[PDB]
Amino acid sequence: QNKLHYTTMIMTQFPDISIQSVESLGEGFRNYAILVNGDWVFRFPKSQQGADELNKEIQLLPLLVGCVKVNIPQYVYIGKRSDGNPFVGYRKVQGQILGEDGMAVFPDDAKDRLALQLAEFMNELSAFPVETAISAGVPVTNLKNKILLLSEAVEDQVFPLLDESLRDYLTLRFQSYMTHPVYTRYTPRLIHGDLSPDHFLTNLNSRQTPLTGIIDFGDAAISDPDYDYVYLLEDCGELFTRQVMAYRGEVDLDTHIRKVSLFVTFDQVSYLLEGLRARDQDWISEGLELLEEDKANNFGA
Numbered sequence: 001q002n003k004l005h006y007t008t009m010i011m012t013q014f015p016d017i018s019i020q021s022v023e024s025l026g027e028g029f030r031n032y033a034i035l036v037n038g039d040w041v042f043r044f045p046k047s048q049q050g051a052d053e054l055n056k057e058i059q060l061l062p063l064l065v066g067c068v069k070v071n072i073p074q075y076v077y078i079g080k081r082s083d084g085n086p087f088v089g090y091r092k093v094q095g096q097i098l099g100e101d102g103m104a105v106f107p108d109d110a111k112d113r114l115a116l117q118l119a120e121f122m123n124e125l126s127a128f129p130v131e132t133a134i135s136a137g138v139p140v141t142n143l144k145n146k147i148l149l150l151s152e153a154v155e156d157q158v159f160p161l162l163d164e165s166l167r168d169y170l171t172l173r174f175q176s177y178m179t180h181p182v183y184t185r186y187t188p189r190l191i192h193g194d195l196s197p198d199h200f201l202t203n204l205n206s207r208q209t210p211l212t213g214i215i216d217f218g219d220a221a222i223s224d225p226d227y228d229y230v231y232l233l234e235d236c237g238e239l240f241t242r243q244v245m246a247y248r249g250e251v252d253l254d255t256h257i258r259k260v261s262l263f264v265t266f267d268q269v270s271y272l273l274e275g276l277r278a279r280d281q282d283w284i285s286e287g288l289e290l291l292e293e294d295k296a297n298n299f300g301a
Ligand SMILES: Nc1nc2c(ncn2[C@@H]2O[C@H](COP(=O)(O)OP(=O)(O)O)[C@@H](O)[C@H]2O)c(=O)[nH]1
Pocket: 025, 026, 027, 028, 029, 030, 031, 032, 033, 041, 043, 091, 092, 093, 094, 095, 096, 097, 198, 199, 201, 215, 216, 217, 218
């Protein structure tokens, strides 16, 4: 709940942590993170889903450290809340959070170095033995069926709010994904699942390695490795994404970019659809704003 309340969980379960400073650090849909002594992130689930995602994270992350070059959270304290659900403490992953708006004014030379690090990172995930991840509780995402269910729920619940031009737009997008076997055929791989620049920790005092780490593995799953590109396209732009894909040895950039483009559209609409289900009056006038612009950005595809 409030600050003394999180503080008190730590003191009781970890009384040898001498607490000198406590601050809010960050917050998402699944978690609330504070910073203790400028050193230690304690991250508390906000819901059952959060708690379930952390559980997977708890099992997955100790397996990824040795196989991933950048820093990732390492859960050094593991607490239990009244409900049996966990919370975790970890050494802050050092550096500055990139964010969307901040990739723009990221130094050009560092930018290219970043793309290559991101490429080896994703390569490293795509190399992690899939059945090993599954045994550690990483869910298998049936992306084909999932997108299908999405098409209907958008038909049913989103269409009534859209003008004709926008409805036609989604039909074609969903159709395009489903009609072309190339887009839908893929080898399932471990992905991060929430690979956006608000989880990139950066450092301009490193010319060789301006990417210091990556956080929030809550959405880690077995799926289409192309899905890990979705926020790179949305937040970092298309030129940056072609760079990463090229560094990953992707022969057909155009095919794979168009495919990721669709993934974006499906995310923008799965967003609204969720705001819809949740009665949120502006997680609705927002989800609509981004659909119109997703339509805009794809001006003639
Ligand atoms: N600088 C820094 N910020 C962090 C770290 N861990 C978490 N945060 C912040 O806390 C926010 C929420 O944590 P996150 O794991 O992404 O929670 P979620 O969005 O609910 O899954 C992040 O977006 C960051 O702003 C870290 O190691 N370093």
